[PDB]
Design a protein around this ligand. Structure first.
Ligand SMILES: OC[C@H]1O[C@@H](O)[C@H](O)[C@@H](O)[C@@H]1O
Ligand code: NA
Length: 441
């Protein structure tokens, strides 16, 4: 029935998806400015140039969080605002902005859970190979140092990266995200330098921090299940689970990269000496899990790597873009708790997209998103019952925003955003979370 009295209850955003003001106050160009302004990369012709205008309107966002009765806010700092050339001088105006926002949050009783990297690499680094270069890892750590030096007296809970799987594989292998490259080896290289940048940043942050910090990383985990028990389908399930989950979990847990995946990738695998793996395993205080979906895998010998395709289940509900499988959240947490060293855990994202509209009465009747929260929160109670050391939950997203290659067309918010007027309105699911949280707090 109940969560811990000190549980963290929040919603989450990322800077490029919400802030707009892309050229204001010294902000540099990010790979997502370049990519979103490249014809055809975004589905609907939109960019993050305005987005939710949260650079100017984070006060309104704070208003929503307050109305929701939350006690925490997960957001990202734009590297392009802080070090506009990527490696070079800081931009004090960038840091001052986030300093005021942090003060605003704390004054409202909202604990800032800051993400340092949620995909907006400065374009000057990409011009020197981006995550294809080990130098990018070094200058990421420098950036992590600068930020914590200035805001670490107030922010205790930091995440280095959000979802390196996406940054590496969507960004450099499949080409669907910025910067838009299409080479496996480049993707795997990028995964390594992300992980290294992570490890280097943790160490830098601990040395720069004016007080002890609780430092984590955020991974999206996709629990994977074989469509049948055939050696073929089981193998496919393993390969997918390795491609998405274990590739990151293992080296973070000090276990190296998974040998099966090393064998599968062959010459495409990155060059990973033992000093880098030691750095990548820098001790963490927590792990963030982003959870959206499962993968029910059939072998797909003719598809590209990892030769494993989703077997649709028409009995399960689907959202605008995903199948709903709440039981996967219990499953992956049970696996983390029993099989890996990370603890405590936070659900740093969970939510869904729907064809939301403002109805005649003025509300947004998103009952399927309410049912989505209710079901996933129920699985978290089960996970807690089994001893999973879960300390918080953040809904993705606080508000409808720029959904990457889908643009402004794919609405994930618990608040509706009118992108013309910038008015936000709380959806019915948001009111349900309010009332649920108020019962738990
Ligand atoms: O697609 C929904 C969400 O997925 C997550 O993996 C990312 O961290 C978000 O930035 C994105 O908005
Ligand atoms: Na549906």
């Amino acid at each position: 029935e109940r969560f811990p009295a000190d549980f963290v209850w929040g919603a989450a955003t990322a800077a490029y998806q919400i802030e707009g003001a892309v050229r204001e106050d010294g902000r540099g160009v990010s790979i997502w400015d370049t990519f979103s302004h490249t014809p055809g990369k975004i589905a609907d012709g939109t960019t993050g140039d305005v987005a939710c205008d949260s650079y100017h309107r984070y006060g309104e966002d704070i208003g929503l969080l307050n109305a929701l009765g939350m006690n925490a806010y997960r957001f990202s700092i734009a590297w392009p605002r802080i070090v506009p050339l990527g490696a070079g001088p800081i931009n004090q105006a960038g840091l001052d902005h986030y300093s005021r926002m942090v003060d605003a949050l704390l004054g409202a009783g909202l604990q800032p859970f800051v993400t340092l990297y949620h995909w907006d690499l400065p374009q000057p680094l990409e011009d020197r190979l981006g995550w294809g270069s080990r130098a990018t890892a070094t200058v990421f750590a420098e950036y992590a140092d600068i930020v914590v030096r200035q805001l670490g007296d107030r922010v205790t809970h930091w995440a280095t990266l959000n979802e390196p799987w996406c940054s590496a594989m969507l960004g450099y292998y499949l080409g669907v995200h910025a910067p838009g490259h299409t080479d496996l080896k480049r993707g795997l290289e990028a995964s390594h330098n992300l992980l290294l940048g992570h490890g280097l940043a943790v160490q830098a942050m601990r040395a720069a921090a004016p007080q002890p910090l609780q430092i984590g990383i955020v991974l999206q985990l996709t629990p994977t299940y074989p469509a049948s028990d055939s050696p073929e389908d089981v193998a496919a399930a393993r390969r997918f689970d390795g491609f998405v989950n274990r590739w990151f979990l293992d080296p973070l847990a000090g276990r190296g990269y998974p040998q099966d995946m090393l064998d599968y990738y062959g010459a495409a695998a990155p060059q990973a000496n033992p000093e880098d793996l030691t750095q990548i395993a820098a001790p963490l205080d927590w792990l963030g899990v982003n959870y959206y979906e499962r993968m029910r895998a059939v072998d797909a010998p003719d598809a590209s790597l990892p030769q494993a395709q989703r077997l649709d289940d028409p009995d399960l509900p689907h959202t605008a873009d995903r199948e709903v499988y709440p039981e996967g959240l219990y499953d992956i947490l049970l696996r983390l708790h029993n099989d890996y060293p990370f603890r405590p855990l936070y659900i740093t994202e969970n939510g869904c997209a729907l064809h939301d509209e403002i109805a005649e009465d003025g509300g947004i009747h998103d009952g399927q998103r309410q049912a989505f929260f209710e079901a996933h929160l129920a699985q978290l109670q089960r996970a807690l019952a089994a001893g999973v050391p879960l300390k918080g939950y953040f809904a993705w997203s606080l508000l409808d925003n720029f959904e990457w290659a889908m643009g402004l067309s794919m609405r994930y918010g618990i608040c509706y955003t009118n992108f013309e007027t910038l008015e936000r309105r709380i959806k019915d699911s948001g009111y349900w979370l309010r009332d649920f949280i108020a019962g738990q707090r």
